[PDB]
Amino acid sequence: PRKMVAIDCEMVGTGPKGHVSSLARCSIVNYNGDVLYDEYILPPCHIVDYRTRWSGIRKQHMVNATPFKIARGQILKILTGKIVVGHAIHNDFKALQYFHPKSLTRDTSHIPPLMSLKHLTKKLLNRDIQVHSSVEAAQATMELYKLVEVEWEEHLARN
């Protein structure tokens, strides 16, 4: 039995026009939705776009923010050898610069048992996400997996 975790990441726009998505905040949960991680991450570059409409992040959060160098080291130690649940997580792998194995990667962006996580978390759980809590968006991705855990893993072996 492999230990399970779910993750949700918020990015900010660094670079000349905020074109580069830099990790700004992360949250990781168990199979039971307990908190393994939740911290504001100070990107190494200057933050040109906070993308608050999509991040919920402003400057006040970057005060007392765990630098990206530290957080990455912290974050990875959880993920190692754990089955990780995440919505479009390969998009975040590059901003974590860790491209976690595929046989342990479960992307709620495609649940082949059968789109934003907001609509999918109401459309399937009757939970309204977006009520500034990557913790909540992590548990949502986690419960979205437990909702389909049994039908998930069988087809993963049958093919």
Swiss-Prot record:
The range of the complete sequence contained here reads 176 to 349 of 353
State the compartments where it is located.
Nucleus, Nucleolus
Name of the molecule in the record: Interferon-stimulated 20 kDa exonuclease-like 2
Give all residue intervals belonging to the Exonuclease domain. Answer: 3-159
The free-text function statement in the UniProt record for this protein reads:
3'-> 5'-exoribonuclease involved in ribosome biogenesis in the processing of the 12S pre-rRNA. Displays a strong specificity for a 3'-end containing a free hydroxyl group.
Naturally occurring in which organism (per UniProt): Homo sapiens
| Stretches of the chain forming a coiled coil according to its record | none
Q: Which domain of life is it from?
A: Eukaryota
